[PDB]
Amino acid sequence: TELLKPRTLADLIRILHELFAGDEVNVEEVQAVLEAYESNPAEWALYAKFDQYRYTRNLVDQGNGKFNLMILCWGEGHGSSIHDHTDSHCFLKLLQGNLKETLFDWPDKKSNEMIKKSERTLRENQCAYINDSIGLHRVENVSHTEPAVSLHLYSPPFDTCHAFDQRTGHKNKVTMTFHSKFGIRTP
Ligand SMILES: N[C@@H](CSS)C(=O)O
Ligand SMILES: [Fe+2]
């Protein structure tokens, strides 16, 4: 009920366990708390494990089963597919660098080019929110010189989703994997 500024990543995690103690989710409250945590690189260095060729997903907390909290690491020019979020809430907070978020509408069943609804540049410490009822999105680090690090919370947890072909709107099921869990590389 009473939202306080998270002092550290650990404190944020404790607050998040409180916010997800029940069966529902106050989206605006979760977003405010995520936004209020000041990114401190020393606190999340353990999870910030990059790969040269694509972005990595690094599990931080399993939220007592109610959410997955993870850190995504985007090399220069690394980006995602256009994807949905499997009927889950999805929060994205920038911890380092910038990411471009492009929004798309759910495709009609006819094969057509997916045209962008809009785009925005998410900046350090800002927290965005998406869910399937809002639409689909692609997230990209368009920087040539700066890696980006983001903190993502999904509730309920999911490890599969759909990728959408921008040319047709065709979807394919994708299994998402973790690069690391609790700071441990999981090959
Ligand atoms: N949801 C994507 C990243 S963009 S929110 C993922 O979890 O891989
Ligand atoms: Fe996403």
Reduced 3-state DSSP string for 47-106: HCCCCCCCCEEEEEECHHHCCEEEEEEECCCCECCEECCCCCEEEEEEEECCEEEEEECC
Q: CB–CB of 164/156 below 8 Å?
A: no
Tell me the one-letter amino acid at 94: L
CATH of the domain at 28: 2.60.120.10
- Which residues are paired to 93 by β-bridges? 127, 151
- In angstroms, the CA 141 to CA 74 distance is 6
Q: What is the distance between the alpha carbons of residues 173 and 65, in angstroms, rounded to a whole number?
A: 23
137 among annotated binding-site residues? yes
Instruction: Return d(Cα 54, Cα 8) in angstroms, integer.
Output: 28
Documented resolution in Å: 2.0
Domain region containing 128: 1-187
Residue 59 CB–ligand 1 contact under 6 Å: no
| Chain centroid offset of residue 17 CA | 18
The annotation status of 85 as a binding-site residue, yes or no, is yes
How many independent structural domains does the chain possess? 1
If 0-12 CB within 10 Å is exposed, 13-18 middle and 19+ buried, where does residue 157 land?
A: middle
Is 71 in contact with 9 (CB distance < 8 Å)?
Answer: no
Name which of 170, 152, 174, 171 is nearest 161 in CA terms.
Answer: 174
- The candidate with the shortest Cα–Cα distance to 136, out of 116, 122, 156, is 116
Please, which experimental method was used?
X-ray
Index of the ligand 1 atom closest to the CA of residue 57: 8
